[PDB]
Short mmCIF file of C-alpha atoms and ligand atoms in Angstrom, two decimals:
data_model
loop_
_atom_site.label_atom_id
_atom_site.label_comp_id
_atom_site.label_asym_id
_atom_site.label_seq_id
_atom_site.Cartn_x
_atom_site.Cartn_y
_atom_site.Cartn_z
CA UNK A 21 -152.32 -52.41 -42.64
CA UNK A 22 -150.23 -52.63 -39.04
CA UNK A 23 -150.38 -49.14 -37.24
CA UNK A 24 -146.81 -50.60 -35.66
CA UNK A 25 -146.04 -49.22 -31.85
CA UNK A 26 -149.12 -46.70 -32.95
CA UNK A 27 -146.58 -44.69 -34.75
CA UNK A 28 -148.58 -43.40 -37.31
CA UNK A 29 -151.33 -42.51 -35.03
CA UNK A 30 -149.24 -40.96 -32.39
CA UNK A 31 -147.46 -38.63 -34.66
CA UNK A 32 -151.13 -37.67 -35.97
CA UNK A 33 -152.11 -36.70 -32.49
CA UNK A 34 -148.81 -34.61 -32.08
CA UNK A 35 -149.57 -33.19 -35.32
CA UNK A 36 -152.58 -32.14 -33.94
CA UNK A 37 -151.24 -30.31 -30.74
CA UNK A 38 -149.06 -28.12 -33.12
CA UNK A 39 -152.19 -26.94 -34.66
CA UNK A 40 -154.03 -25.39 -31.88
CA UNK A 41 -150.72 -25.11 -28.91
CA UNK A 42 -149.15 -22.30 -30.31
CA UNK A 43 -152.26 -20.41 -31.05
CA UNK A 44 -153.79 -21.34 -27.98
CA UNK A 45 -150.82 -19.84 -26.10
CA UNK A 46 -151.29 -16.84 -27.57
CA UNK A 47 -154.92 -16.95 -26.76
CA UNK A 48 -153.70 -17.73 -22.92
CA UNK A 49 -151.33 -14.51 -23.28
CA UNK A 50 -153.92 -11.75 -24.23
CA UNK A 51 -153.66 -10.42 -20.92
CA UNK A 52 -150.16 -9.39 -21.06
CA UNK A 53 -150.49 -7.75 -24.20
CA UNK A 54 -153.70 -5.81 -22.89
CA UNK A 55 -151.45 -5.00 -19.93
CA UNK A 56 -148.65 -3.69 -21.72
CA UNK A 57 -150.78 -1.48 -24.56
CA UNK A 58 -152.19 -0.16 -21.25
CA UNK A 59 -148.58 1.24 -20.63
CA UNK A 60 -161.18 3.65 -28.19
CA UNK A 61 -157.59 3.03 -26.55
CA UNK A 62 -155.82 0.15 -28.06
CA UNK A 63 -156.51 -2.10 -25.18
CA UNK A 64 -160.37 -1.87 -25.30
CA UNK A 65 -159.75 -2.73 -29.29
CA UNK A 66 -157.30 -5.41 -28.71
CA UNK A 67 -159.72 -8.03 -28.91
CA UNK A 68 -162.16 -7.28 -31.85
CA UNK A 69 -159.22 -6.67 -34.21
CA UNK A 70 -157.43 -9.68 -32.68
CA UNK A 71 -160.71 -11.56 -33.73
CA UNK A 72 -160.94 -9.51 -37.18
CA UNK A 73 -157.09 -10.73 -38.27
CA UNK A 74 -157.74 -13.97 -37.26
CA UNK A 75 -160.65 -14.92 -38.29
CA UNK A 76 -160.48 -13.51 -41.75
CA UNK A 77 -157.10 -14.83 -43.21
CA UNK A 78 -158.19 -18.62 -41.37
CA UNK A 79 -161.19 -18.27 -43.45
CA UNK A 80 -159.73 -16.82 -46.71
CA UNK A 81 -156.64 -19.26 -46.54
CA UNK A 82 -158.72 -22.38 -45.27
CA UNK A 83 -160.87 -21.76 -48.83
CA UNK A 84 -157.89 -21.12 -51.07
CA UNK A 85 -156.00 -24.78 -49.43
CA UNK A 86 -159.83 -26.41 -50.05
CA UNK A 87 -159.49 -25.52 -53.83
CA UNK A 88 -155.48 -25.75 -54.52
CA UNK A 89 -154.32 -28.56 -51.85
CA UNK A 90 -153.80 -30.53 -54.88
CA UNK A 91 -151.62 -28.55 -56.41
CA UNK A 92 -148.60 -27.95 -54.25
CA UNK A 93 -147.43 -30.86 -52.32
CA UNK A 94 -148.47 -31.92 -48.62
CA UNK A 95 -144.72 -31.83 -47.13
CA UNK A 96 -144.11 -28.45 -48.70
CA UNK A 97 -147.35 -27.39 -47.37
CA UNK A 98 -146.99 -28.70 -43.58
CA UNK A 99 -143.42 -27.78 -42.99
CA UNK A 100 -143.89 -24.48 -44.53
CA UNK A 101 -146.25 -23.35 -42.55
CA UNK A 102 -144.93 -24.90 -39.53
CA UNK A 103 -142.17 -22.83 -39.77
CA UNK A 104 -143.82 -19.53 -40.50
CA UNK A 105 -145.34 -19.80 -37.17
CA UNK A 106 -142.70 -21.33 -35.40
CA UNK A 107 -140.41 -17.75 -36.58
CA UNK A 108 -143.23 -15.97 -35.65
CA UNK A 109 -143.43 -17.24 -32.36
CA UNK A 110 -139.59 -16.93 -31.69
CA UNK A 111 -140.45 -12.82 -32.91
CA UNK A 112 -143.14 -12.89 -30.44
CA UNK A 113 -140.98 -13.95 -27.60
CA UNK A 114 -138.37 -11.85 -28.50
CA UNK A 115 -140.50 -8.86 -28.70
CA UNK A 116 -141.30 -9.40 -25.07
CA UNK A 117 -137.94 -8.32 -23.78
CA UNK A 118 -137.57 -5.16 -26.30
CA UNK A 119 -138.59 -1.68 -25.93
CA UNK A 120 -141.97 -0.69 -27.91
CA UNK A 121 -144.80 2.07 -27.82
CA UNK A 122 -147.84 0.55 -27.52
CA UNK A 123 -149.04 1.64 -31.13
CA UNK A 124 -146.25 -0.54 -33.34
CA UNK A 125 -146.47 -3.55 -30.59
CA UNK A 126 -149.93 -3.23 -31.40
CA UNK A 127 -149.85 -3.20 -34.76
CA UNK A 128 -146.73 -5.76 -34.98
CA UNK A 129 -149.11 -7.66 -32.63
CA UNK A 130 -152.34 -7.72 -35.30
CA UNK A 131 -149.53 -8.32 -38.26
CA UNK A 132 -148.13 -11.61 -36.43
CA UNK A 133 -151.49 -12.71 -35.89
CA UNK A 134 -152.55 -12.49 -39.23
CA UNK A 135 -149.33 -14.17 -40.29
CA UNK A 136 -150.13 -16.59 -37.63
CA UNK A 137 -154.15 -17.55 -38.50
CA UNK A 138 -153.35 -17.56 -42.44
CA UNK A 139 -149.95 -20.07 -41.93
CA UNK A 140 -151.84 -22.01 -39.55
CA UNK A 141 -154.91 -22.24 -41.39
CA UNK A 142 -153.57 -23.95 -44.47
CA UNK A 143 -151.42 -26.30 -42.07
CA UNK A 144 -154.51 -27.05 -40.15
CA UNK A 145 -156.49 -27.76 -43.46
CA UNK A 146 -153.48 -29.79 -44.96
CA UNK A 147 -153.49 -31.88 -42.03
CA UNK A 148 -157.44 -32.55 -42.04
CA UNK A 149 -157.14 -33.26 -45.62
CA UNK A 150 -154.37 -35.85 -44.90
CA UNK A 151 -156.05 -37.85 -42.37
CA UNK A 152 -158.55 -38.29 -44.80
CA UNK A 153 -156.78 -40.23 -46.62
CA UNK A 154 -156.05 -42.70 -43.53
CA UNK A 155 -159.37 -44.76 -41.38
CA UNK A 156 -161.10 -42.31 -38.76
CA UNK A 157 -159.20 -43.33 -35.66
CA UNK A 158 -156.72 -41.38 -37.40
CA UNK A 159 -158.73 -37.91 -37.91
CA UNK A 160 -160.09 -38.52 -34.54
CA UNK A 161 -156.11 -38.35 -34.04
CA UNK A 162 -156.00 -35.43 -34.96
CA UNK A 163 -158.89 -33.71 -32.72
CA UNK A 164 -157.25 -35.86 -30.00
CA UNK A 165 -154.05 -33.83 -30.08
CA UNK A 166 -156.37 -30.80 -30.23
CA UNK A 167 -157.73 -31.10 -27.23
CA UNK A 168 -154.87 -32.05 -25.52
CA UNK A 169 -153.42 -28.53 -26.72
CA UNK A 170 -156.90 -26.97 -25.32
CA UNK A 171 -155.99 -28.60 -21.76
CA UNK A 172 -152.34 -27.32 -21.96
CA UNK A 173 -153.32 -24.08 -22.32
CA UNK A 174 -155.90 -24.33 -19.64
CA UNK A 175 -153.38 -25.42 -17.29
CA UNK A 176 -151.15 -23.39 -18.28
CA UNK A 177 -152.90 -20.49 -17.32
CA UNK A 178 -153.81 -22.01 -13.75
CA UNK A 179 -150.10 -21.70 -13.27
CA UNK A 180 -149.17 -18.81 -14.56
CA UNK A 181 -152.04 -17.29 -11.86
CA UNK A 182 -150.49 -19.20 -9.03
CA UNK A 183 -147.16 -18.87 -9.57
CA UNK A 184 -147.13 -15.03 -9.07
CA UNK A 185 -144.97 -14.48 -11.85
CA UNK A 186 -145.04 -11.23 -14.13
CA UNK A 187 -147.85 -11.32 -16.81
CA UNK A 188 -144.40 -10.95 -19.01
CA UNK A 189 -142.34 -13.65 -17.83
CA UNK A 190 -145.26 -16.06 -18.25
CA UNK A 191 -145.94 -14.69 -21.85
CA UNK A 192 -142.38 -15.17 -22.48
CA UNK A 193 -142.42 -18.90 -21.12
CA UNK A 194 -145.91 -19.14 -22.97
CA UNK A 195 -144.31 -18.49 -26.12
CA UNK A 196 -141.01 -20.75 -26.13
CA UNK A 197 -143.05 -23.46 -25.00
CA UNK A 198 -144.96 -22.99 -28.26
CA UNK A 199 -141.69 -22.73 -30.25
CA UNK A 200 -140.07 -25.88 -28.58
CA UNK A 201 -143.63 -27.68 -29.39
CA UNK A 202 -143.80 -26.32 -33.08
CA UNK A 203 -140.11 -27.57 -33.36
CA UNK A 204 -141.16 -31.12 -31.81
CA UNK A 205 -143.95 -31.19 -34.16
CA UNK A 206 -141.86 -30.56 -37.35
CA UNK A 207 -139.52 -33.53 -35.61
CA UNK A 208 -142.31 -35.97 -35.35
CA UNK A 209 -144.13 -34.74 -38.98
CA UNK A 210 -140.30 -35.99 -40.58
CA UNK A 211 -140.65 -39.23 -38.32
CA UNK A 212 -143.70 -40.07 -40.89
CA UNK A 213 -142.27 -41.47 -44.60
CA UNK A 214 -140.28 -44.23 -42.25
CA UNK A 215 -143.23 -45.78 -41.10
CA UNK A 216 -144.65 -48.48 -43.55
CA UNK A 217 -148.30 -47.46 -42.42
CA UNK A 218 -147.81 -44.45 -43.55
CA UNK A 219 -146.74 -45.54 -46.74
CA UNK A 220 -149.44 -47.77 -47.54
CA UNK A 221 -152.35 -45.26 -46.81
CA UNK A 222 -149.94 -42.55 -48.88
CA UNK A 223 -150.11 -44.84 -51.74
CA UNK A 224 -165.60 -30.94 -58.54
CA UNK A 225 -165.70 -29.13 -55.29
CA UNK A 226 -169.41 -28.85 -55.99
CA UNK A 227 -170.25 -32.60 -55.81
CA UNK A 228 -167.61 -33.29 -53.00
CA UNK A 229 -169.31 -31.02 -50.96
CA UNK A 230 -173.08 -31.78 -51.98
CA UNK A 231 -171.99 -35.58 -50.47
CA UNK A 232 -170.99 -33.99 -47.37
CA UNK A 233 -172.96 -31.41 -46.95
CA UNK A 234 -175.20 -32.75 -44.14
CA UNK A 235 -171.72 -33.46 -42.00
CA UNK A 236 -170.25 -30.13 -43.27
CA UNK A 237 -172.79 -27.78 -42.04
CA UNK A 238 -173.22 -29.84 -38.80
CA UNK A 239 -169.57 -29.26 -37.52
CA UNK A 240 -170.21 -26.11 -39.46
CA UNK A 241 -173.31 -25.39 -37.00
CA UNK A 242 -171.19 -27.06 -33.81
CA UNK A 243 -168.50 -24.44 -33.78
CA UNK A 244 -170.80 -21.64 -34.79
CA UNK A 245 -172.97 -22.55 -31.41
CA UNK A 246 -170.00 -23.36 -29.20
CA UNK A 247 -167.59 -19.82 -30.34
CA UNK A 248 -171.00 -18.26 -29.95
CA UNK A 249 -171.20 -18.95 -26.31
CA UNK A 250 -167.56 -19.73 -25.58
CA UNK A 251 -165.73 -18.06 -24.05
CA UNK A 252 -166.86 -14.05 -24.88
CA UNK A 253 -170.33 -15.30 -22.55
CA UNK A 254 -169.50 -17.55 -20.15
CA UNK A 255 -166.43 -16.16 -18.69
CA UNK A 256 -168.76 -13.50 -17.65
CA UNK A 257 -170.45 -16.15 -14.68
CA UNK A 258 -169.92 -15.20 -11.18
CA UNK A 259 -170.02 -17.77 -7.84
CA UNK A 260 -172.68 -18.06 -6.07
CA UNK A 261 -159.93 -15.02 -9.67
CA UNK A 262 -159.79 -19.47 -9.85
CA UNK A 263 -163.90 -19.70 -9.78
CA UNK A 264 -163.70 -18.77 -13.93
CA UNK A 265 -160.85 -20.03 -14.94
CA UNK A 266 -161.26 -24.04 -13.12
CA UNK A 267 -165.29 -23.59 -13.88
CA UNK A 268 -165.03 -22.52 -17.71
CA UNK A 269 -161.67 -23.33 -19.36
CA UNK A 270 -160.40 -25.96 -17.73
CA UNK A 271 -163.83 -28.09 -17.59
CA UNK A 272 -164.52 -26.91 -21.36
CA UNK A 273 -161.06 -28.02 -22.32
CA UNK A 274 -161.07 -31.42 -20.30
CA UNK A 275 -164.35 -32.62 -21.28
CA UNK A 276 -163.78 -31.32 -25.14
CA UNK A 277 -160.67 -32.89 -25.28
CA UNK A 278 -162.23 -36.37 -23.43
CA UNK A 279 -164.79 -36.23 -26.10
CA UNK A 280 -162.42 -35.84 -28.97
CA UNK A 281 -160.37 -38.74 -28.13
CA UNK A 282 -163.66 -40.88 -27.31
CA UNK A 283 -163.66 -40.92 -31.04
CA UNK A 284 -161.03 -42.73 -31.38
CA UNK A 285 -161.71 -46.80 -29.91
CA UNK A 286 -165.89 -45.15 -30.24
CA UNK A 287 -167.54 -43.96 -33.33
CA UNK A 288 -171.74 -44.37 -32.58
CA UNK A 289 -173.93 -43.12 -34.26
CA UNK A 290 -171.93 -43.54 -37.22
CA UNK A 291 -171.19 -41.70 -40.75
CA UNK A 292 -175.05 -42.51 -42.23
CA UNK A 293 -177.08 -42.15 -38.87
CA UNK A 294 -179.13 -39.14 -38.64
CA UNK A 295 -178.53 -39.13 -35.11
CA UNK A 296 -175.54 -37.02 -35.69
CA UNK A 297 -177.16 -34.10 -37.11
CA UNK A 298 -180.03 -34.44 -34.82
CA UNK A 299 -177.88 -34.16 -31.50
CA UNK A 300 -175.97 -31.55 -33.08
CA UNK A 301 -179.37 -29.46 -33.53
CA UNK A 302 -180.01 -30.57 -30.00
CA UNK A 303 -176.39 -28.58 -28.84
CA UNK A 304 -179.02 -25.32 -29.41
CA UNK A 305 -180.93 -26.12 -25.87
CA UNK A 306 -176.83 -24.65 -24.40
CA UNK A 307 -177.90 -21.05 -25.58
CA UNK A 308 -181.14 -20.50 -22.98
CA UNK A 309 -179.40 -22.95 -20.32
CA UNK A 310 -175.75 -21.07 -20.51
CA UNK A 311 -177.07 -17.47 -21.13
CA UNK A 312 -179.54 -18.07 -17.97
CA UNK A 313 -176.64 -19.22 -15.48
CA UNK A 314 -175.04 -16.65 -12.83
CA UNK A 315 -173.66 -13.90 -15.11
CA UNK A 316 -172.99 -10.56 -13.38
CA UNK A 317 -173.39 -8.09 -13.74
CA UNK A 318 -176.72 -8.81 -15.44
CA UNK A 319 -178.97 -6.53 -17.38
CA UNK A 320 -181.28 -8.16 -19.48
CA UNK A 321 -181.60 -11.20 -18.69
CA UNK A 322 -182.17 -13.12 -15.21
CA UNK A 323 -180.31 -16.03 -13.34
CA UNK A 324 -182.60 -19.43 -13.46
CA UNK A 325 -179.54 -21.29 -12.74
CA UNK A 326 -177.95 -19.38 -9.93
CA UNK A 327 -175.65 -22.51 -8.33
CA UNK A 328 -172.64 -23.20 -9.52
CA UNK A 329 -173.24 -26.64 -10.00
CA UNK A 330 -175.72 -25.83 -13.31
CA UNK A 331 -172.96 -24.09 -14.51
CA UNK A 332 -170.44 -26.72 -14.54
CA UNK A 333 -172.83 -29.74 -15.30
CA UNK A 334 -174.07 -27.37 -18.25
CA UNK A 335 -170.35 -26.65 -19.46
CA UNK A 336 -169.25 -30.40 -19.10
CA UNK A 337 -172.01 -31.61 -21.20
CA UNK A 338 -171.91 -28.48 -23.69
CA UNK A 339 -168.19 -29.29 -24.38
CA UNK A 340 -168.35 -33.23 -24.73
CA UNK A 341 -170.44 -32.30 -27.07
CA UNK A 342 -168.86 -30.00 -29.17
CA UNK A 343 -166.63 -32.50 -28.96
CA UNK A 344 -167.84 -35.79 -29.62
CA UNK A 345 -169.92 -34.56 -32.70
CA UNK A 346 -167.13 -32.66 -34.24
CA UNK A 347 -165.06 -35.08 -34.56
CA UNK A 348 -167.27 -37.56 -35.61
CA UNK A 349 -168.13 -35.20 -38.35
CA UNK A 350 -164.17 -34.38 -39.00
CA UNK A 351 -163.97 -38.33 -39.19
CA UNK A 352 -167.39 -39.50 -41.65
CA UNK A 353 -167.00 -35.97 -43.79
CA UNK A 354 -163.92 -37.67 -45.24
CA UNK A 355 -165.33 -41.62 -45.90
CA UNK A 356 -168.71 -40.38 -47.20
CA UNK A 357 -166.74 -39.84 -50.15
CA UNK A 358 -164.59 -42.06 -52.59
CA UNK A 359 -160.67 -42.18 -51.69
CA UNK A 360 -159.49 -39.87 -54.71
CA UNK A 361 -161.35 -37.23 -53.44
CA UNK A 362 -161.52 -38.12 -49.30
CA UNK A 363 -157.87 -35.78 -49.30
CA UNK A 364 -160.47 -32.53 -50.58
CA UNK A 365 -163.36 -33.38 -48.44
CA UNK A 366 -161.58 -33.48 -45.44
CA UNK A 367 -159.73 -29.89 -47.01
CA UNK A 368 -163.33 -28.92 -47.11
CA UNK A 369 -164.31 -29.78 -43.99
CA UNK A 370 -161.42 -27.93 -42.33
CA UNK A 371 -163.29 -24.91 -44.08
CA UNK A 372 -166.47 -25.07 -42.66
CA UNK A 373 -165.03 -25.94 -39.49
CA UNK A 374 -163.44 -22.53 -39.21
CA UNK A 375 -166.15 -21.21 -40.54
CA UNK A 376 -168.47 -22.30 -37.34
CA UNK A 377 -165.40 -20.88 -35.74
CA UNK A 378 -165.68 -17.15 -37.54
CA UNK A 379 -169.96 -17.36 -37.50
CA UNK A 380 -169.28 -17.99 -33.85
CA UNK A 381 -166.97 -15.37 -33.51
CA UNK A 382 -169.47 -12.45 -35.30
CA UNK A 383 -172.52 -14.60 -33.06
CA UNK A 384 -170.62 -13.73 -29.89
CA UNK A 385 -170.12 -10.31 -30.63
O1 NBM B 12 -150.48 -24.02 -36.34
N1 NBM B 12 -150.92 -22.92 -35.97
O2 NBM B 12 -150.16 -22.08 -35.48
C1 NBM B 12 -152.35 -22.61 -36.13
C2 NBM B 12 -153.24 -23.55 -36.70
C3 NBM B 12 -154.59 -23.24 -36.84
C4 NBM B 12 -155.07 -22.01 -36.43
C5 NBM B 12 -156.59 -21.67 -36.60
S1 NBM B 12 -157.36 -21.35 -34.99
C6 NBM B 12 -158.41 -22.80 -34.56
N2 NBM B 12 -158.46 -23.84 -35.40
C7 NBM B 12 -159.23 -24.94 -35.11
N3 NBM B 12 -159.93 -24.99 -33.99
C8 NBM B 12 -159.93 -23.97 -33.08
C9 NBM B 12 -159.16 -22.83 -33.33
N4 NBM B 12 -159.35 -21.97 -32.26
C10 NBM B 12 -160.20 -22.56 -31.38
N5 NBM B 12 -160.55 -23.80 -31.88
C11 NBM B 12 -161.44 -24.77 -31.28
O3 NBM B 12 -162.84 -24.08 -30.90
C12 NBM B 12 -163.35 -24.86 -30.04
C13 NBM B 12 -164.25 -24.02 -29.07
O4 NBM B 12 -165.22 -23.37 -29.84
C14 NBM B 12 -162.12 -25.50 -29.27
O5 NBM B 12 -162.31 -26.85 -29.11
C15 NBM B 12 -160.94 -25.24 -30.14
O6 NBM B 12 -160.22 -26.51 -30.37
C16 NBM B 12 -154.16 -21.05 -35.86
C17 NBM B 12 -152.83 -21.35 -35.72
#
């Protein structure tokens, strides 16, 4: 077992970016499309049914791949869906430069998302449940290239700011960059049967998950806390236009994505120590400390940590975190398991993983 050149691992992490880039993008876009529905209004809306159609067919979809990823084959799968989105995303562009009322952009909007979550969903699942298959560096691969796509977008949007350029034209560059990644992905997912490492690790739901249920509900519980408070609360901090976006994105999305690929060469506590559930409890001190930073305006609730300084040493910690810990469970979930079945646990874990994500999402609201 020779990982040649990295290959194999390197494509993982690519496969990876493609999971979370293109949606991410579209995340990054979301003021351009509240800018042109401007043009109970469908604005104010925009982002509870965005959260609705996305979070719903991930879930759905994610659940139907955990119990039927067996059944239809793992190229068909991948590709598949990596195409869906990738002709989504070209629509998306393309709708940029056409003429449309704000109630069928809208609309077309909600229906591409949808399209979008569901696709990506059972690509992201497929992918998790692959891995499995292959040691932990190579899940941790995975989360690596996640990040990564986190810290694109977050830079992305830095630019897009500076630059000065039309909340359309950066949309529009927003979404052929995801196309040209998606079609880079697809490239580098082909790249795979030609690599000898990949070929050697290629060659009841109810028990699966009662073995990893302790790692399932802890990355479960991660992305329940961290969607909870990021980003619907925190972009809401004030110093004490480039104060939220450096302060919250991009430290969330470095230190995440740091964390994530920490996992890679460093895997402590391991996939048996109770440490790992207990520090993932622990993430629950980041509610009180992040809810009592400078948010304005403020009702409710005071500011104990008025300097900016709390606010960033509490985000940079909060997102290693999140993290570290996920992707150590993402990793163990998988090898607490026997190999036959490590392909559905990881499926499984892709699940609950979304569902932290959706929890999170009803949390913040
Ligand atoms: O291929 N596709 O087009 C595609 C693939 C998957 C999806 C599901 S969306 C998703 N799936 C996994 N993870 C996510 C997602 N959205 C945010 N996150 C993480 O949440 C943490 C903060 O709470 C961050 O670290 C993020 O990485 C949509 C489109």
């Amino acid at each position: 077992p020779q990982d040649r050149y990295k290959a194999v691992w390197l494509i993982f992490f690519m496969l990876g970016l493609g999971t979370l880039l293109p949606w991410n993008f579209f995340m990054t876009a979301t003021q351009y499309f509240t800018n042109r529905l401007d043009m109970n209004s469908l604005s104010a809306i925009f982002n509870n049914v965005m959260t609705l159609c996305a979070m719903l067919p991930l879930l759905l979809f994610t659940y139907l791949n955990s119990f039927l990823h067996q059944r239809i084959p793992q190229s068909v799968r991948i590709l598949g869906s990596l195409v869906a989105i990738l002709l989504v995303f070209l629509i998306t562009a393309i709708l940029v430069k056409v003429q449309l009322d704000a109630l069928p952009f809208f609309v077309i909007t909600m229906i591409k998302i949808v399209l979008i979550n569901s696709f990506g969903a059972i690509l992201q699942g497929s992918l998790f449940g692959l891995a499995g298959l292959f040691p932990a560096s190579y899940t941790a691969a995975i989360m690596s290239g996640q990040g990564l796509a986190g810290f694109f977008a977050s830079v992305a949007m830095i630019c897009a700011i500076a630059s000065g350029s039309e909340l359309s034209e950066s949309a529009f560059g927003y979404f052929i960059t995801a196309c040209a990644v998606i079609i880079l992905t697809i490239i580098c997912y082909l790249g795979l049967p030609r690599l000898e490492f990949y070929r050697y690790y290629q060659q009841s739901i109810k028990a699966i998950l009662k073995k990893i249920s302790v790692l399932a509900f802890s990355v479960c519980f991660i992305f329940t806390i961290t969607i909870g408070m990021f980003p619907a609360v925190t972009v809401e901090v004030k110093s004490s236009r480039y104060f939220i976006p450096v302060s919250c994105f991009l430290t969330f999305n470095i230190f995440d994505w740091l964390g994530r690929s920490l996992t890679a060469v460093f895997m402590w506590p391991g996939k048996d120590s109770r440490w790992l559930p207990s520090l993932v409890l622990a993430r629950l001190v980041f509610v009180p400390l992040l809810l009592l930073c400078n948010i304005k305006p403020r009702r409710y609730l005071t500011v104990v940590f008025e300097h900016d300084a709390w606010f960033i040493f509490f985000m940079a910690a909060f997102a290693f975190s999140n993290g570290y810990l996920a992707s150590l469970c993402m990793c163990f979930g998988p090898k607490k398991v026997k190999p036959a079945e490590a392909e559905t646990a990881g499926a499984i874990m892709a699940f609950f993983l979304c569902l932290g994500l959706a929890l999170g999402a009803v949390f913040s609201f």
